[PDB]
Amino acid sequence: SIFRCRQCGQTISRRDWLLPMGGDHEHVVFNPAGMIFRVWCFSLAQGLRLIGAPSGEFSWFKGYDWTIALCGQCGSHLGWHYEGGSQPQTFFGLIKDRLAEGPA
Numbered sequence: 001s002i003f004r005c006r007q008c009g010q011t012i013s014r015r016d017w018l019l020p021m022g023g024d025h026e027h028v029v030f031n032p033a034g035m036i037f038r039v040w041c042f043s044l045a046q047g048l049r050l051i052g053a054p055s056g057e058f059s060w061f062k063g064y065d066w067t068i069a070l071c072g073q074c075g076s077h078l079g080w081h082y083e084g085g086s087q088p089q090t091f092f093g094l095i096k097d098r099l100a101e102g103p104a
């Protein structure tokens with residue numbers, strides 16, 4: 001039911017907050033460095049630190065700009081916050097294998 005940071009246990013999100021963007025909460029993507037991510041979209045998340053200002057470059061999600069989202073506790077890269085778009089205006093794309101799932 002709750003997702004925590006796999007490295008340190010910081011409280012991050014909830015299964016209840018999964019968001020099906022374009023029909024699926026799961027999206028498999030690669031960046032310009034060829035890294036493949038299995039990204040789960042969430043309407044809401046907490047315990048992150050968003051670093052820098054948003055960028056639209058190479059955005060996986062049409063009409064959204066991204067900011068890097070670290071674990072606010074341990075600084076591990078957990079995904080991205082997306083903003084600037086429509087319906088919803090914002091959401092989080094978190095890297096599923098960087099989270100741990102477990103009880104409330």
Ligand SMILES: COc1cc(N)ccc1C(=O)N[C@H]1CCC(=O)NC1=O
Pocket residue numbers: 030031032033057058059060061066080
């Ligand atoms: C400018 O993107 C990068 C450049 C690099 N040299 C290395 C990595 C990234 C990177 O992971 N970009 C991601 C951000 C999220 C997004 O939606 N799409 C991406 O492609």
Ligand SMILES: [Zn+2]
Pocket residue numbers: 005006007008009010071072073074075076
């Ligand atoms: Zn952490």
